Amino acid sequence: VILLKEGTDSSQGIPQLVSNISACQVIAEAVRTTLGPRGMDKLIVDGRGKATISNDGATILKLLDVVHPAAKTLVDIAKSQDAEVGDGTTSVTLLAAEFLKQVKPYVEEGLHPQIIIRAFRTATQLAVNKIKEIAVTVKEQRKLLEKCAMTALSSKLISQQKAFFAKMVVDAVMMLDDLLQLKMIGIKKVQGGALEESQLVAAKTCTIILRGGAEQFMEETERSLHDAIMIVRRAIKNDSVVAGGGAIEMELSKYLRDYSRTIPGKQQLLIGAYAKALEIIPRQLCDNAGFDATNILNKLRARHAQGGMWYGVDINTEDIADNFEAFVWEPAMVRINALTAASEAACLIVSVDETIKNP
Template sequence: MVDTGISSENVSRTMGREAQRNNILAAKIVADIVKTTLGPKGMDKMLVDSEGNITVTNDGVTILEEMEIDHPAAKMMVEIAKTQEKEVGDGTTTVALLAGKLLENAEGLLEKKIHPTLIVEGYRLASEKAERILDEISIAVNSREVLKNIAMTAMTGKGAEGNKEKLAELVVEAIDQIADGNKVSSDDIKIERIVGDSVKDSELVKGIVLNKGRVNKEMPLTIVNAKILLVDFPLEVRSPEMDTKISISSPQQMEAFIQSEEIYLKEMVDKVAETGANVVFCQKGIDDLAQYYLAKKGIFACRRVNKSDMEKLARATSGKIISNLNDVSTEQLGMAGEVEEVARGDDSLVYVRKCNNPKAVTLILKGGTQHLVDEIERAVKDGIGDVVAAVKSGKVVCGGGAVEMELVRRLKHFARSLGGKVQLAVEEFANALESIPETLAENAGLDPIDVLTELRKRHEAGAVREGLNLFNNKIEDTFQAGIIEPIKVKTQAISSASEAAMLILRIDDVLISKSKGEDKKVREMIE
């Protein structure tokens, strides 16, 4: 810590080699936290928040998000994990581990008096070369079985392990349904969770399931051949937009005022009925009297359906969301074979199913406890993210550390074509990639040195697809073994990790402003 002499006493400053060392240490600590969760034999973490809520998971981004991290460099590690989750949905542990290893290796170069700018240049060249190599060694997606293997690989080692085949089949079937060629979005898959049944009872509904019930118990429980009206305005008497005072001087005027409201609501329901709709989903509220009139006409209605669910209902039923009842026509109604309310304990679910070629579907995930269902959801989201990424790019790579070992071999060959100290940085970048198969072996209880030695030998011999199959603890062709990952997981992880490492390496001065009461906390954080 250095006193600048020109800034407020409420500003702490760390500079030069000390600033770099502190930032690198923070990043390494974050990487070490998630390191043991990598791979099918990775361990879980138990996270307990300030209110005593417990989360048991080995999902990298969940662990990092739940931790209350203060250090600025450590926060960057959390950000790259969030970016990986947002862009792909999987590979969050890999990106944090890789960034930590890149910085650890850079520290060795800094100790040899190699300037950070040269290290950054080497890392940039290596990252660009790695992405080109990945494209060269990628494999085209040519079957549904490959997609199923991708989903199973993503879910391996998580709470879904025992039922990964069933869940992978559901994930691939869901994406098959919503995909339009290579255009597909994970936003079109809704996930509903049910606590109490077995994981193997999870199902895919080709339509939408809402955690709602009918607004009135006199409405029918089931509607067959449903004609669905989707509205984003309230089925209520409109309130004036400004403060309004109504003066009533006699009981007759009061009665007339009440009757005018009833007439308005009845006319509104009559308009709904005239469209031929027998199901209404409303984004806003539905007046009690309107509920009564809808029930009398045998119309099934739900209120306060959130906007994202309304959009999914439109995609599933081919309906249009209406903003004005006067514009409603039969062509704008959605269609479904069946709409049904199903009671589950004190709650109800509304199933909109048997839709004709729905472009939005629902995965219902079941499990014996809330913790299990939460972990199943995280695993399934990883699977969905990976399969979507594979469908979009049409390319996959071998898992089990095979792709990393091939990158290491080719990057080291590339480094030899470079001159000067940049060559050392490219070599350290390659060495950092070896941390992935090394950690996979370590977490499985294998000797990482033996595993790395054998992998190097096989890749030097041209066995590009050879990796570590932790289901039988053998080194073999991981593509044939069904251990497959989308290329996007690797390109995004390498890009994000190298960018974060380069950004942290370029920092040689850290100035932190604080309130007077935070002085001790900040000192502890950066020292």
């Protein structure tokens, strides 16, 4: 009764969903630690002994030998986020998995997959909406770019000399800013000396000359800068900026649950989960520091539903804090796409009914 190839592992109905969903979940967990200003860099090691140290999700997922097709999709999600937004590659990867963790409790009960996609799809729609109706837009204001240039460098190894670098960044960006193309600013790492020597060889087109005692305080610094250029750039290209620290997630997660009590039927319970999933962001945010996620999470929702859409989670202090006053702003697009890529993609994951493999 040979109806399957040699060494083919193919499951059907509900079971296939479990396997696929699980695979994605555990895979995201690996890169879930690299999340947060104090993530945990990983030292992947191929079969030839090459040990690499990277904190980027994409770089990691592209170096890990994945045999399970379901787990391959995640590498695709990490490649689409790495070439569409840059940073956060981990967010979309982890998020997509979380959603699968919220559907599972329904699939293991009987809830039809497609019916689940309908809700998730609808959920993503509503979510993104609120993101384009509460975003902020202020300002080439070297006064606002520098302030955010110091808050960006902070939480990293260049928070020690964030004062200087924050300037070179605002200047490097202030020269080439028709929409600022990150391909016009050449960064040159030069391990040697102290990070207090670095200069910005400017008109248009500059070359951030860096100098650090060792490649540790050289690289770890550089990376922190690339971020300031990623944030300062956006505020100038796309004024669209949203509250960070998992604040947005907390608000959406709230209203989304409100749309549950309103929208009866299957969607109610699910849309609620789609929200419970958006709680993963601020959740892991504290775990990546050492503070209890429960307490803060619960505290956040309160201070959030009793404050505003800026109340995020000041991990640096391990306590709720208004991001609007903490100058914690990120481009609205970052979130705008996160919801898109992560969600819709995850849906298909449960949409893929059974997978046929071969030897």
